[PDB]
Design a protein around this ligand. Structure first.
Ligand SMILES: COCc1nn2c(CN3C[C@@H](CC(F)(F)Cl)CC3=O)c(C(F)(F)F)nc2s1
Ligand SMILES: COCc1nn2c(CN3C[C@@H](CC(F)(F)Cl)CC3=O)c(C(F)(F)F)nc2s1
Length: 479
């Protein structure tokens, strides 16, 4: 009964406290620290999508087992997303981010030394389970330090690190394992898939190391009744910002903050309680006051992920076909296209970041979705490799804006006590959509050119039609 009023008061006071702390060196530091975490997810996604389907041809496998590994890893990412997103609302943002990154790093490290396909599959699956939790936790964790004045722009600036991780993975793949030799094969060669697997883990290890230095989210502390810890963290933020700005004498004035109020047997009971609470949050996401928002969010996210991850398998085959037609008269191609795509995304992320708080989230999302639909439709007309690459750059440049807007909107539409639960559920749905799109678009490879693009464009059109119905959030305190 009373809790809604108490939480509204908490949000209103928290916004004022953040305005007192201001924006400065602390948020700039946290920005890079969490950017490393996003980069790790980018690296893993690239490895699953482009390296491993290329390595499947050298590692010995039965024909029926060829596509198994990516499916398994994406399902692991789905499970990890739901698990860590749910737990981050009960144990904390920093805690769960540390745990998930540790899992990812440990099993990525272990996968370098295995001597068989089964054990490699196991270790890679658990690495996926680990990394699946990063994005939902990262975005909420960063959002909880941002004042409403420029929260959208600051959240939008965060998405570059994912593309940077993709570029990092592609460059390391080209440098270390050209031709994608993957024999289960090193003897300390420094030019081997084991060394590539190790090098891909560096962003996650650095993320863990840097993240150990950062404080836990004070909003999480306040929502769980820990007044003094939240006060200490907020004082740390204020003092860091003011000392960096050359005003060490300024005093943090906040006096009091609103707050909300055998060994194995004990562990079992604890786990049961945690499961019950996570399930309660997940079911609350479909309560009468959030059901419609959740369903519309599901539709939009599913359609966007479906179209993108279907194109991830459509485009390389189109390039191969065009190259074959031209020749009728490698890793470097992937690295080159990835680098150009990142350079194309960059202007789109700059523009969307600068406009996010100027024109609102809904208009950004709708315009970017329409432009994404049309740019996807244009792919059917490419007659040559250069034109195809240019059109892919166009599509990425326009779609990054819609993904940014939907990230901000997803952050702001859900309350802090279940934000990471909602975000994790949506991210798990996105990875399920990735699985489905990859399989369905793989089924088209032998048939025709146009139907996959028409299908993706229709999916994006439906996504935009749903996106038009979401409520605007610009100019509101973080619920
Ligand atoms: C909707 O379309 C997306 C496609 N991206 N993409 C690429 C390169 N990437 C890889 C992407 C990033 C990550 F997912 F890997 Cl982490 C960004 C990008 O541009 C290629 C290839 F270069 F291999 F040919 N083919 C396609 S489709
Ligand atoms: C709801 O949960 C799922 C989310 N995934 N996701 C990502 C990761 N991307 C970026 C996409 C490729 C693009 F070219 F379109 Cl930017 C594909 C993808 O999966 C980001 C990002 F950091 F990139 F901004 N934001 C969110 S939300």
């Amino acid at each position: 009964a009373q809790r809604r009023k108490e939480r509204e008061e908490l949000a209103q006071q928290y916004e004022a406290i953040l305005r007192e702390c201001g924006h400065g060196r602390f948020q700039w530091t946290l920005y890079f620290v969490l950017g490393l975490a996003l980069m790790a997810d980018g690296v893993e996604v690239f490895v699953v999508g482009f390296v491993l389907p290329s390595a499947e041809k050298d590692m010995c496998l039965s024909d029926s087992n060829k596509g198994m590994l990516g499916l398994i890893v994406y399902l692991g990412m789905m499970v990890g997303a739901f698990l860590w997103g749910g737990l981050a609302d009960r144990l904390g943002r920093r805690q769960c981010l540390l745990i998930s990154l540790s899992v990812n790093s440990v099993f990525a490290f272990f996968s370098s030394f295995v001597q068989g396909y089964g054990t490699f599959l196991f270790c890679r699956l658990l690495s996926g389970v680990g990394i699946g939790g990063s994005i939902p936790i990262v975005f909420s964790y960063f959002s909880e330090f941002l004042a409403q004045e420029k929260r959208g722009e600051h959240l939008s600036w965060l998405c570059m690190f994912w593309m940077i991780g993709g570029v990092y993975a592609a460059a390391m793949a080209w440098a270390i394992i050209p031709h994608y030799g993957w024999s289960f094969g090193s003897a300390y060669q420094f030019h081997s898939w084991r060394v590539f697997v190790l090098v891909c883990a560096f962003p996650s290890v650095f993320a863990i190391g840097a993240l150990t230095t950062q404080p836990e989210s004070p909003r999480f502390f306040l929502e769980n009744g820990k007044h003094d810890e939240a006060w200490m963290v907020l004082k740390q933020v204020h003092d860091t910002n003011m000392r960096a700005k050359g005003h060490p004498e300024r005093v943090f004035s906040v006096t009091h903050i609103k707050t909300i109020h055998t060994w194995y047997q004990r562990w079992g009971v604890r786990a049961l309680s945690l499961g019950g609470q996570v399930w309660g949050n997940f079911l609350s996401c479909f309560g009468p006051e959030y059901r419609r928002i959740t369903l519309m969010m599901m539709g939009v996210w599913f359609t966007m992920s479906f179209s993108y991850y279907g194109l991830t398998v459509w485009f390389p085959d189109m390039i191969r076909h065009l190259q074959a037609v031209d020749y009728a008269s490698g890793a470097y191609m992937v690295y080159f296209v990835s680098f150009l795509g990142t350079l194309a995304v960059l202007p789109g992320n700059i523009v969307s970041a600068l406009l996010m708080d100027k024109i609102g989230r809904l208009r950004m999302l709708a315009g970017s979705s329409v432009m994404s639909c049309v740019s996807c439709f244009f792919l059917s007309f490419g007659n040559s490799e250069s034109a195809m690459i240019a059109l892919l750059c166009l599509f990425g440049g326009v779609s990054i804006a819609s993904w940014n807007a939907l990230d901000v909107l997803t952050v702001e539409l859900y309350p802090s006590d279940k934000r990471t639960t909602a975000f994790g559920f949506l991210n798990a749905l996105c990875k399920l959509a990735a699985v489905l799109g990859i399989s369905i678009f793989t089924s088209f490879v032998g048939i025709t050119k146009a139907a996959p693009i028409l299908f993706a464009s229709a999916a994006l059109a439906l996504g935009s039609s749903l996106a038009l119905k979401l409520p605007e959030t610009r100019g509101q305190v973080l619920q």
